[PDB]
Amino acid sequence: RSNIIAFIVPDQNPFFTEVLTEISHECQKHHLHVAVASSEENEDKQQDLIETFVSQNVSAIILVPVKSKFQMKREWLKIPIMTLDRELESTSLPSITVDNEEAAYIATKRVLESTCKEVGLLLANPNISTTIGRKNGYNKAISEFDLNVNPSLIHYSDQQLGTNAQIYSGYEATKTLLSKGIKGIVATNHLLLLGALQAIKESEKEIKKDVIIVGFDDSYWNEIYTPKLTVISQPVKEMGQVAAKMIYKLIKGKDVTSIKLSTKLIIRESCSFN
Amino acid sequence: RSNIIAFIVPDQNPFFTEVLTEISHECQKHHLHVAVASSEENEDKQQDLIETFVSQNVSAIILVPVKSKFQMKREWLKIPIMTLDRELESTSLPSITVDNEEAAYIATKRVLESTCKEVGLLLANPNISTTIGRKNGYNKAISEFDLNVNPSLIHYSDQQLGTNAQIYSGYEATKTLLSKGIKGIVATNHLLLLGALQAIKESEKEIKKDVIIVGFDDSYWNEIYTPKLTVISQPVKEMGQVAAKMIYKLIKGKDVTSIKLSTKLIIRESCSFN
Numbered sequence: 001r002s003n004i005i006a007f008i009v010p011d012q013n014p015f016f017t018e019v020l021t022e023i024s025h026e027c028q029k030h031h032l033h034v035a036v037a038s039s040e041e042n043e044d045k046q047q048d049l050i051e052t053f054v055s056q057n058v059s060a061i062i063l064v065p066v067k068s069k070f071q072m073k074r075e076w077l078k079i080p081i082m083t084l085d086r087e088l089e090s091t092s093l094p095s096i097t098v099d100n101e102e103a104a105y106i107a108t109k110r111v112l113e114s115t116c117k118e119v120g121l122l123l124a125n126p127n128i129s130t131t132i133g134r135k136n137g138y139n140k141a142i143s144e145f146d147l148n149v150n151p152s153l154i155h156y157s158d159q160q161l162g163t164n165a166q167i168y169s170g171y172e173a174t175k176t177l178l179s180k181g182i183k184g185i186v187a188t189n190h191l192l193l194l195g196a197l198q199a200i201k202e203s204e205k206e207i208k209k210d211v212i213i214v215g216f217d218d219s220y221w222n223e224i225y226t227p228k229l230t231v232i233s234q235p236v237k238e239m240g241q242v243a244a245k246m247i248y249k250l251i252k253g254k255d256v257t258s259i260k261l262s263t264k265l266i267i268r269e270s271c272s273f274n
Numbered sequence: 275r276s277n278i279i280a281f282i283v284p285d286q287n288p289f290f291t292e293v294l295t296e297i298s299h300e301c302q303k304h305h306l307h308v309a310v311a312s313s314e315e316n317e318d319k320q321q322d323l324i325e326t327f328v329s330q331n332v333s334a335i336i337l338v339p340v341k342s343k344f345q346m347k348r349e350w351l352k353i354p355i356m357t358l359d360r361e362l363e364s365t366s367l368p369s370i371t372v373d374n375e376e377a378a379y380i381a382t383k384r385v386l387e388s389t390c391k392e393v394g395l396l397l398a399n400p401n402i403s404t405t406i407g408r409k410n411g412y413n414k415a416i417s418e419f420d421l422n423v424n425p426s427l428i429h430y431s432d433q434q435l436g437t438n439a440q441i442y443s444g445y446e447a448t449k450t451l452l453s454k455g456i457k458g459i460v461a462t463n464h465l466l467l468l469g470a471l472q473a474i475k476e477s478e479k480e481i482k483k484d485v486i487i488v489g490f491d492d493s494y495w496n497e498i499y500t501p502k503l504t505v506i507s508q509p510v511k512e513m514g515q516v517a518a519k520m521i522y523k524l525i526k527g528k529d530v531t532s533i534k535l536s537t538k539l540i541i542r543e544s545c546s547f548n
C-alpha cells in the first residue's frame with residue numbers, strides 16, 4: 001500500500017483545510033501522509049478522483065461527498081473509506097459529522113431572541129445532508145416561536161458548483177433579502193457567510209442597526225471583523241483527532257462506528273441590535 | 275505513472291489554494307489531477323512528501339520549497355519537477371515566480387507617500403527567496419525617499435514553523451511596532467497581515483488615524499474589512515494557468531523556461547490617513 005491517505009473535498013471552505021491539518025498531525029504518527037484533492041462540487045471529478053486513488057492503492061480514503069445520493073462502486077470497496085461532514089443516502093460506511101439540526105436551531109433561535117421574527121436563511125445545495133440538517137434546525141426554531149415558515153426567506157446555492165459559486169449565492173440571496181427589508185440572516189457555511197457580508201458591505205446598511213447576522217464556521221477574521229462575527233463553530237480539532245483514529249482502525253480492519261459531534265455558538269457582536 | 279500531479283505547499287495561505295484551483299482547472303483538460311499536501315514549513319516533512327510521491331510514481335511535482343537551500347536526490351530526478359512562488363539557490367529546476375522586489379517597492383512607496391517616514395516591515399523567514407526579494411524592494415523605496423534603512427523596523431517569521439507561527443509573528447511584531455509609535459506598516463503576506471490586524475485591533479489604535487497598512491495577497495476579507503485593505507495583488511489566475519502549461523510540457527519531456535510575472539497594487543482604504 002501507498003502511505004497516502006486521500007482526503008477528497010468538495011470545495012475550498014477553510015473548514016476542510018483546518019480539519020485536514022488536524023488529521024495530518026495525528027496521521028504522521030504512523031507515517032501516513034494526507035493528500036487533498038478537491039472535486040469542486042463536480043460529481044464526475046469526484047468519481048475520477050476515487051478511481052485514481054483506488055488505482056494507486058492508497059492506505060485509505062476520506063470522502064466528503066458532493067451529493068448524498070451516490071453509490072460506491074463495488075470495485076472501490078477494497079480501499080478503507082469513511083465519509084466526513086456529510087453522509088451518503090444508503091451505506092454502512094462510517095462517518096464523522098456534527099449535529100447539524102442543533103447547530104442551525106441554536107443559530108436561528110439566537111436571531112429570533114432579538115426583535116427579528118422574519119429570518120432569512122442561506123443554505124448550500126439541498127442534495128447535501130448538512131443542508132437538510134441545517135434547514136431542519138431552522139424550521140424547529142421558527143416553530144418553537146410559533147412562527148410560520150416562509151419559503152420566500154430560504155435561499156439555496158443550487159445554480160452552480162464550487163467555492164465561488166457558493167459565495168455568489170450568499171451575496172445575491174442577501175442582496176435580495178436586504179431589498180425586502182429583512183433584518184436577520186443565518187448563513188449556514190463560511191462561504192455563504194462571506195457572500196452575505198459582501199452584499200451587506202456593498203449596500204448602505206449597517207450591522208447591529210439595519211441587520212443582524214449569524215454565520216457558520218469560525219475564522220481568525222471573525223474576531224477582527226467590524227463588527228465581530230457571531231458564528232456556529234465546529235469542533236475541527238476533535239473531528240480531525242477522531243477521524244485520524246477512525247481511519248487508522250479502518251486501515252487495521254477493525255470495526256468502526258459513526259461519530260456525531262456538537263457545535264457551539266460563539267456570541268460576539270453581529271447577532272444583536274445596538 | 276499515475277495521473278496525479280503533486281502540489282507541495284508550505285502553509286495554509288489562501289494564496290496557494292487559489293493557485294491550486296487554477297492549476298487543477300487547466301490540468302484536468304489532460305485528465306491529470308492535482309493533489310495538495312503541506313509541509314507546514316518543515317523540511318523533513320517536505321522530504322518525506324517528495325519521497326512519498328516519487329515512490330507512487332506521480333506524473334509530476336510542483337514544489338513550493340520551504341527553503342532556498344535544497345538539492346534533489348538523484349533518485350527523484352525521474353519525476354518531472356518545478357518550483358512555484360520560490361526559487362532555489364542552485365538548481366536546474368524551472369520556476370514560476372513574481373517580481374518580489376517590485377512588489378514590496380510599490381507597497382513601501384505607497385506608505386511613504388503619506389506623512390509617515392518610519393515604516394515597519396513584516397517578513398517571513400529570510401531563508402525564502404520571496405522574503406529576500408521583498409526586503410530588497412523595501413530598502414529600495416526607503417533609499418529613494420532619502421531615508422536610511424533601520425534594521426529595528428524589520429521583523430521576521432523565523433522563530434517557529436507554519437501557519438500559526440506566521441500569524442503570531444505578524445501579531446508580536448506589530449504590537450512591538452505600535453508600542454514605539456510607528457505609523458506605517460507593510461505586511462508582506464496574508465498571514466503576517468492577519469497577525470498585524472489582530473495586534474492593531476487589540477491596541478487602542480485606529481487604521482487611517484493612528485496607523486496605515488499595506489498587505490500582500492488577495493483575499494475576500496480585503497474588500498469587506500473595516501477599513502478596506504490595500505494590498506499587493508498576485509496574479510493567481512495567470513500563475514496557475516501558466517504553471518499548468520509548464521508542468522504539462524515537462525510531463526511531455528519538452529523544454530520549459532522559467533517565468534516571472536508582475537504583481538499589482540490595489541489601493542483601497544487602509545493605506546491613507548483621513
Ligand SMILES: [Cl-]
Binds near residue numbers: 098133
Ligand atoms: Cl443531523
Ligand SMILES: [Cl-]
Binds near residue numbers: 372373375407
Ligand atoms: Cl525577485
